[PDB]
Structure formats: C-alpha cells, structure tokens
Amino acid sequence: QNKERRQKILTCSLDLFIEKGYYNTSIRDIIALSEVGTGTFYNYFVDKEDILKNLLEDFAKQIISSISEYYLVEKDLYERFIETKRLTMEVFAQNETLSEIYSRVAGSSAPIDQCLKQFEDRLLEFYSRNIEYGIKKGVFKNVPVSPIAHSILAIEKFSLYKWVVLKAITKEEMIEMVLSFHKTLAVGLLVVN
Amino acid sequence: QNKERRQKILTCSLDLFIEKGYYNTSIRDIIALSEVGTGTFYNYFVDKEDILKNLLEDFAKQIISSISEYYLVEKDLYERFIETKRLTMEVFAQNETLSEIYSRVAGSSAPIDQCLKQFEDRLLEFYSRNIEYGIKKGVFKNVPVSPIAHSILAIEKFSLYKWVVLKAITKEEMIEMVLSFHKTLAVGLLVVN
Description:
The structure is a homodimer.
Chain A: H1 2-20, H2 27-34, H3 38-44, H4 48-71, H5 77-94, H6 96-105, H7 110-136, H8 145-165, H9 171-187
C-alpha cells in the first residue's frame, strides 16, 4: 500500500518530467497530479531530487537483478560478458521515458549530477565486481578494472542517448553497436599480441 | 581582421555561457560584451546556435589537425592508437571552458543536440578512417568500425564530464583511464583467443 502510493508518485513525476521538462516541473505539479496530498507526499519525498534518486535506485536495482538472475543459469563468463550488455540495453528500453530523462539531464546542475553519480557509481561498482571475477577465473586479463567499467557504462550511455534522444539510430542498431563493441573488446583490436 | 572579430565574439560567448548558462545567455548579451555592433555581428552569426557550431568546428579542427600532424612523424599504428587519445585529451584540457559547455549541454534540446551531432559525427568519421587504415595494414582485426569509433568517443566524453563537470577525478586520472582502456581494447580483454 506504501508500494502503490510510492509508485503512483514516481509514475506521475516521470510523466511530468517528460511533458514539461525536469526543471520546469514543481513538487506542486507532482502532488496535484499524484493526488496523494501534500502531507503524505512528504512521508516519501522531500523534493524532486529525492524523486529522481528513487527512480534511479529502482532502475539500478532492476539492471543488477536481471544480470544476477541470469548468472544463476549461464556460467560461461564470455557468454555472460556479451549477453549481459543486451540485457542491460533491454532494461533501458523497458524504461524508455526514464532512459530519456537520464539521457537529457546529465551535466545540467550539481544536485542532479550528484543523483546521476550515485546511480552510475552503483553500476560501475557492480561492473567492476564482475570484471574482477573474470580476472580471478583466468578468463580476463589482469588489467586495471575501473577503465573497463567506465567504458561499458560510457558506450551504453552514449548509444542510449543516440537512440532515445537523437533518434539517430534504431533500438536494434543500438543493441548491435553495443554488442559488437564488447565482442571486439573481448577478442582485442590488435591482430597480434 | 575578420579573424580577430570572429574570435572576439567566440571568446565573449564562451565566457557568458560559463557565467550565466548557455540558455540564459542572449545574442543581446554577447553583442553588448563583444562591442562589435549589432550589424557586424550578423555578418558572422545569425544566433547562439551559429556561435556554438563555430566554437565546435574550430574544436574538431584542432583535434583532427593535432592527430594528423603527429601522423607525419610517428608511423607505428599501435603507438598512434594510444598516443592520439592522450593528444585528444590534452586538446580538451586546453579548451577547458568549451569542454565544460560541451559536457553540460548534451541532451538539452534538439537544436543544441543537432550542433553537438555535427561535431561528434565529424570526430566519429575521422576515428573511423584511422581504424579502417589499421585494418587494411593488418594491425587491427577486421571488425565493424562504427562501434569502435563510438566507444572511443564515448569514453572520452564520459571521462571529460567526470573531470570538468563532476570534479570527481583529476586531469591525470582522466588521461590514465582513457589510455588504460585503449590499451586493453588493443590487446583484448580475454586471456585466450
């Protein structure tokens, strides 16, 4: 019941962010469209940034649990390396309107960048754990991990932006690009080493 | 003389974008701070987006010519692969205030995204030509090129943003991350292939 209401406020907030723009949307607009009352709203959120953190927490959680669930059945670490990128790209697509907001508000102001930083740091740490595991199991080379986690995040962010914001590529083209890059990263660009 | 004036308008525009924010800055503010007169201003630019395109054209041009000049002396394609990323990261640092604007206005509106798209497409095409050359010379594997060019651009964009906007890493850490990733991309993440 706390779940329903929390969810109603988040869906309405997302819709208003898409329709009016994140900065042009007020807590007033959200409370009015949510209809939960000013007092109940504050049992959950203090302002817009609290709403954005909560939207992105749920998002990170869905990405990380989809991957972790897949790990229970597929054990080949290379198969995991590729397919987890497709999985992630599909979570983005299931949350299209949020992917859009994520892709539009980066670098806009320090409080919003602080929110995106918590979301991104969480994904980066997870990606690091999984790369570390592969190094330990002799499948991946023992290289610095943080640059690799950042490269995964970066291409995912950039290709999402080109699909959902620029409309310059299709969902399919975005998925293909991302998988192709991870394949090449895995096998290595150099012919000889 | 056309050069001096064009340059004065661009420097002033950059300063106002940093100080007031790109959207809060008007052509009025720029013409007033530039002092070139309303009529002369229009011999060069029709609006802010014309100024942004011109700032980014010069930027792309400086990145591409630094790399092309280096190519006249270093012929090892792997040495080029790494060091060109350091060169690029240094051009970003020499144009810190522009790197900031670039890192802040992405996804903000379709006209500004159209401007960034021309800048990014230009870099992507150049990066593609250089990867293609390496494939043809047997140094790089024959893989799809566009995902690789996008991955180079993406990590460069993302690590620039974390330095100049988030202030979460140092210039040095940004340069190291980017070089480390390109090294791993080159040698390949997998132990065996």
